[PDB]
Each structure stands twice: as C-alpha cells, then as structure tokens.
Amino acid sequence: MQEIIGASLVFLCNEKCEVLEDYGVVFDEKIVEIGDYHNLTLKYPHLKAQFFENSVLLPAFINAHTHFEFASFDYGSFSGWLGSVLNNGCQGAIQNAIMAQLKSGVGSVGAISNHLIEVNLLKESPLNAVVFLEFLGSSYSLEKLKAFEAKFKELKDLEDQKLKAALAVHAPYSVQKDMALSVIQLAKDSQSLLSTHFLESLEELEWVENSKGWFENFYQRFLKESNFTSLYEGANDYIDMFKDTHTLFVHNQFASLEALKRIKSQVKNAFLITCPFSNRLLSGKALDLERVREAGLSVSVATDGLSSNISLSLLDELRAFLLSHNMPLLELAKIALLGATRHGAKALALNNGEIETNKRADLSVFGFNEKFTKEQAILQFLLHAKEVERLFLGGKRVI
C-alpha cells in the first residue's frame, strides 16, 4: 500500500545536499512523491500519515565495506597488525552484527566474504546486500582458480532482489597478477562489481614501487612461498588491470595524486571508499581529502570490519571521520552525509541513498529533543545521531 511520512528536517542527500523543513514523502515499495507534509496530507487525505517533530528523515545508510568474518590484533602499525592477523593463521556474532547496522540506520551493506558464512543470514535480514567474494592468493594455482570460480557459482545461485553477487581482489601484496586477471575477467563475464584494498599502508607503497620494505620477508615467514620481488611492477601496473570496470578502491591513504588521477582516467567508474577509524589503528595516516578532490574523485565512508575497529555503527565512524580531517567542519559534514548515502549507493550501484522519485523506499527517521537550525541540521545530526527511531526498507517497517 501507500503511506506518508514527514519530519521537521528532511535530508534529500542530493549532490546539492539540500535540507528541507516540515517536508513529507509518500512511498510504497519506491518513493513516489515529495513535498510539504501538510500539503501532501490534503492531496492524499486517506493515506496513513505520520509526522515526527524535532526529527530528521533521511535515506537509509550504505556501508560499502564491512567484513562480518570477525581485542586480539595489534594496533599502531600495519606490519604489526598484519603480522598479528597472520600469527592467528562466528555465526552468532554475525546474527547480532547485522543488528548493529539496522539500529544505526544502515539499510544496504557491501560485505566482503571469504567462505560465504554470513550470506545465508544476510538473506533473511531486511538488509540490501552486495557480497564480494574475496580472492586471496600470491601463487598461481589453476586448481584453486577453479575452486574460486565454483564458490562464485554458489553465490550466483543465491541471488535475490536484495542480494547482488560481486567479487573482490584483496591487495597488491596478496594476489598474483595472473590470478587477478582471471578474477577481473570473471567479473566482466558475470557483470559484477570489483572491490580492492589499494595503497593502505606505507609498507605496501614501498613494496609496490621499489620492491623494498617490510614485504621482503612477508612471503617467506607467513605464506610458505619463496618470493622476494613485488607481484606488480609499480602502482600503475596494478591499476590498469581494473581499466573499464566498476571497481571499489578502499583506503588509498598512500596513493599519490598521480595514482588517483590514473585510477579516475583508467578505471573510468572508480569509487574510493574510506574508513577513518581503521586507518588510525593501522597505517596511522588519514586520507588526504583535498588530494581526493584534486584528482576528481569522491569518497564513501565505511566502518570496515571489527578486524581493525571498535564499533561498526556507521554514525560513530562518521564522527571519527569528522575528527580525522582538518577541513572546514561544516563542509566536511556534508562530505560525510553524502559519503554515507548517495556516494555509497552509487559505488554499490543501488537504487537508494537519495530522497528522489522512483528510488528505493529506504528511509531512516532519527528522533532528537530539539530542532536544529537549517544551517546546522546536517552537522548537529552527525554529532547526536546514535540509534534510529524508525527504519523503512522497501516500504516495509523494520525497526
């Protein structure tokens, strides 16, 4: 059926980043019409209508990078964290970790999975899911190459209207060149998305550029292989593999302006994803947001996983995103809201993240105790938003 909802502040989440006051929207499975809440209640008098005063009505968030496979690990260094994850060499937390996204207002997630453990629970959840099956392998092996293209077939046999199948190549230090050319080709063949970790550390930059640094000893101590040279001969050699695709580039805190200009000019449809908290614990260098826009790209904000973070609430990761950059606060607060909405749905190629006609009815309502001023609404929301009062996904009431 059809129903009307309106709040004292409505965040359209357009590229203009428009906030409207006392507006309402009518929706079924999709968003049909927008306008003033009172004028809408006269136009459609018989539709059920609810208004929320001193509340914010916005799109449901999109978390494009989150691993549900997970103290333990070491923070303060990337080498120390990777060493501590490999010195290590789940079903119940997964059913409660989805609940941490719904209550935070997240309606769509781009989850990276290695063994397809959480995909079954993501299907009964109301969440919009884009599972990237991640490929890990620094030695060529035709045997595992077909054991990975057979696990993807199990993913494509589980697709719905809520779960889309995608594929991921881990990092330039973990995947051999001819094993990624096959993964990338299968994504073109299956017409699915690509996610990848790119220049996340200073040690990976030293490794990819000049075959030096902490990675001389990585393949010997941890992988039982005898390799002492980089799998790729420079940063551009890794990028050109993703030419003419829809590739999600995560982190990129150590990619130079020439490197991101190359990503934009060559990948054609590249989407940079950033996770503020995980960069602090690991590499320690935050993403230069000016360099991002000096190259012509935009960022989405993601929680990453509890592999290198303390809370997977997208709102708490937004505040840490605000504290991590010296940009003018009120402009950067718009980069966060759009990086958690429209920019995250365009990276995942979904039909939500914006209050627009014919878009998915993925709506969040957040209740407060005051009415923020229109000039401050976007920033006051990010500081005080913690839980969600109402969450509508596909026009169905979930929370």
Residue number, 118 or 304, with CB nearest to Fe ion: 304
- Distance between CA 312 and CA 70 in Å, rounded? 11
Mark the segment that binds Fe ion (CB under 5 A) among 95-103, 202-210, 290-298, 301-309: 301-309
Q: Which residue is nearest to Fe ion (CB)?
A: 304
Query: Concatenated DSSP letters for 316-373?
Result: HHHHHHHHT--S-HHHHHHHHHHHTTHHHHHHTT-S-SS--TTSB--EEEEE-SS---
What are φ and ψ of residue 30, in 5° steps? -125, 170
Q: Pairing between strand 106-113 and 61-66?
A: parallel
Residue 323 binds which of Fe ion, a second copy, none (CB < 5-8 A, kind-dependent):
a second copy
Least separation, in Å, of the C-beta of 287 and a second copy? 13
Residue number, 70 or 75, with CB nearest to a second copy: 75
Residues 6+ apart with CB under 8 A from 323: 276
Mark the segment that binds Fe ion (CB under 5 A) among 41-49, 300-308, 342-350, 378-386: 300-308
Exposure b/e, 342-353, CB count within 10 A at least 16 = b: bbbbbbbebebb
Residues 6+ apart with CB under 8 A from 71: none
- Distance between CA 213 and CA 170 in Å, rounded? 20
Residue number, 245 or 308, with CB nearest to a second copy: 308
- Distance between CA 107 and CA 128 in Å, rounded? 6
Binding-site positions for Fe(3+):
65, 67, 197, 304
Contact positions vs a second copy (CB under 8 A): 71-72, 74-76, 276-277, 280-281, 284-286, 310, 319-320, 322-324, 326, 328-330, 333, 368-373, 375-376, 379-380, 383-384
Residue number, 191 or 326, with CB nearest to a second copy: 326
Beta-bridged to residue 363, according to DSSP, are 59, 392
Residue number, 126 or 276, with CB nearest to a second copy: 276
Residue 17 binds which of Fe ion, a second copy, none (CB < 5-8 A, kind-dependent):
none
Residue number, 286 or 399, with CB nearest to a second copy: 286
Exposure b/e, 112-125, CB count within 10 A at least 16 = b: bbeeeebbebbeeb
Least separation, in Å, of the C-beta of 65 and Fe ion? 5
Least separation, in Å, of the C-beta of 367 and Fe ion? 30
Cα three-residue angle 10-386-28, rounded to 5 degrees: 40
Least separation, in Å, of the C-beta of 63 and Fe ion? 12
Identify the residue whose tokens are 């989150």: 66
CB 194 within 8 A of CB 249: no
| Residue 88 to residues 35, 72, 73, 74, Cα–Cα distance (Å) | 54, 9, 9, 11
Residue 326 binds which of a second copy, Fe ion, none (CB < 5-8 A, kind-dependent):
a second copy
Least separation, in Å, of the C-beta of 302 and Fe ion? 8
Least separation, in Å, of the C-beta of 232 and Fe ion? 19
Least separation, in Å, of the C-beta of 374 and a second copy? 12
Residue 280 binds which of a second copy, Fe ion, none (CB < 5-8 A, kind-dependent):
a second copy
Residue number, 22 or 240, with CB nearest to a second copy: 22
Residue 369 binds which of a second copy, Fe ion, none (CB < 5-8 A, kind-dependent):
a second copy
Least separation, in Å, of the C-beta of 303 and a second copy? 14
Cα three-residue angle 6-11-14, rounded to 5 degrees: 130
Q: How many residues bind Fe ion (CB under 5 A)?
A: 1
Helical ranges in the chain per DSSP H:
37-43, 78-86, 91-102, 119-124, 142-156, 177-190, 202-210, 218-221, 235-239, 257-267, 276-281, 289-295, 314-323, 329-339, 342-347, 377-384
What is the number of residues in the chain?
A: 399
Residue number, 304 or 317, with CB nearest to Fe ion: 304
Residues that bind Fe ion (CB under 5 A): 304
